[PDB]
Design a protein around this ligand. Sequence first.
Ligand SMILES: c1ccc2[nH]cnc2c1
Ligand SMILES: c1ccc2[nH]cnc2c1
Lengths: 346, 346
Amino acid sequence: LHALLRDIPAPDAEAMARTQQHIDGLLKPPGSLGRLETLAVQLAGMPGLNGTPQVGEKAVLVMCADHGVWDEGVAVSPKIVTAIQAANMTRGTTGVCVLAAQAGAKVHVIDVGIDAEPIPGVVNMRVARGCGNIAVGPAMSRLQAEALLLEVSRYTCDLAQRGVTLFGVGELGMANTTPAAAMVSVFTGSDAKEVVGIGANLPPSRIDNKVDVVRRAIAINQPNPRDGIDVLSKVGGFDLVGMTGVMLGAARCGLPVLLDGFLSYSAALAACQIAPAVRPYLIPSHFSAEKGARIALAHLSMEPYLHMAMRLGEGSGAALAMPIVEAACAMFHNMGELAASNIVLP
Amino acid sequence: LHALLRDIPAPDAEAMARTQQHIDGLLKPPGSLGRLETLAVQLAGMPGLNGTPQVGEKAVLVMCADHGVWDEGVAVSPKIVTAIQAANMTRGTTGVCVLAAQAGAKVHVIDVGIDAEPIPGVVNMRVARGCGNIAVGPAMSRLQAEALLLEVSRYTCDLAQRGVTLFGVGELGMANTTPAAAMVSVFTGSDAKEVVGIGANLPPSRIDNKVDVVRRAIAINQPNPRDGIDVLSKVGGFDLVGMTGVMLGAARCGLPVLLDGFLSYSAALAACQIAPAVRPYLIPSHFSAEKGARIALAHLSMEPYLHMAMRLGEGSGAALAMPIVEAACAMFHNMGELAASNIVLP
Ligand SMILES: c1ccc2[nH]cnc2c1
Ligand SMILES: c1ccc2[nH]cnc2c1
């Protein structure tokens, strides 16, 4: 694992400079395509893309797991929904499946800790049947977190060998907005009340209890904000760990990864704490409707492209943004040049 | 023309109600897909879509024209760029062409007033070689504006007969951000200084002159804010009129139209003033980086889905948003249902 973090490549400034120059000469007023231009340049600097903004195969990895904190009454969705939805992911009827299909991406469903019998068709990487209740103790041991990080990281960069050049991350786990809020609070130093949302339609009256649960988890576990793995193992979850693993793996592979919503922002905070070198590889997708989204994004210094007031999760936002990444590549490679049209601008 | 405005259909509340009910039962927490759900419902209410959110063929109409106000030194792009770019539109090397191709849409280039010889391949609907300099008089006569509105409206709804169900609007015209600002100022009652931007990279020092030009145009012409056609003919342009015509035509046809940037917001303000019934058919795309974007959008009560800091125009933003509209349709038709998975939520 120390080798993994050590070997994450820095961005290629040389390719980025060549990219910027090419974009400047395209058929349009310099800088007029805004964030589409900066995105293209960002892509060009990723070693796994061979010096140019390009998109080959696309995949969305959905990490599924159950949480012991569900027993604290922080979620109104039945716990069994995690397992039922995981199965639906194999039949292509879920939100992410439908949107990924639209973007031409393949969905990989991974079980990292569902509290149910194994589901045929789902990639098995389960650590245990649900993680520990963070309200009374740690979600898992440090060893379990490190082991999963490596496992998911390897699987991720392995897909790169199959032609995948663009990743999207997602999750599935009832009650996971609680550990997500805990992590955001710890990493950003914000009070729990400022980052606890209603998740999957939690009644406004049950919010108080959720905030209390978040504080108890932090108080009881005392996670170290400077240790991303300590935070993940103490107040995170198997799914959160898995998402962080995808980011570390894509980064090691020198490839881009599209974030999704609030759950993914929490995992990105951890990933960047563990290895700041991961940051240049992350691409935001949408601006989650979850209460603590603004805070999490500010700390990641990210501004999403899409404002859809979405809060489904599953990696649905990541899939919705894939066309945008392809659009930046199309602009770069297919637009004509000013010089060719004898157009000269100041 | 009075028949055109009179015959714009109201939205189908019955289909919208059936649409909402169906979306509520999909495999996800109610309302979790946010604006994707509201967009799907909006689409369902458009008569031309046959009671359901669907997208058939897509087309982006780019209105091209030159402006006499260019002589006032309000634009740094050579005037001939309008004609050169119009031609490039026929070869698919422009920004809109590349992005439309990515969305599977066809680009229709229409010359409504380019100050140059006719360009082969471009749809000819030119009123004159450039409109009048709005700084010293009106851009055109009321009769010329009404005639073009009808011509473009007919062409637009005619495409609906060819299978087109989704329109995008764009423009091409050096210096057109000046008349655009004038119109926005008049319709919103905002001071020119608050809505005049740098357009196609106008130097910060030349901004003052642009603001003065806008005020002179309004003072000299005295356009009536309550008369959308009066404003268009006095301080607008042929391209602006054409864009308004596409919106009136799509609305008459009961079909959706995706806006683009600031130029298109100005035209939408006029369209809705002329016929409020047009509003339910307009769909925003991105949030333009032009200074007066926030003001224009607030008056249209619109919140764009994309924040790309784009300011190229041509209808590039409209094309970039088409995948989003198709995504709302995919969600509606392809997602599974909660009842089928025995999932019951509060
Ligand atoms: C210069 C070059 C290309 C353009 N497309 C729209 N306005 C332009 C100005
Ligand atoms: C209920 C139904 C579908 C879901 N997908 C993600 N969380 C869910 C809760």
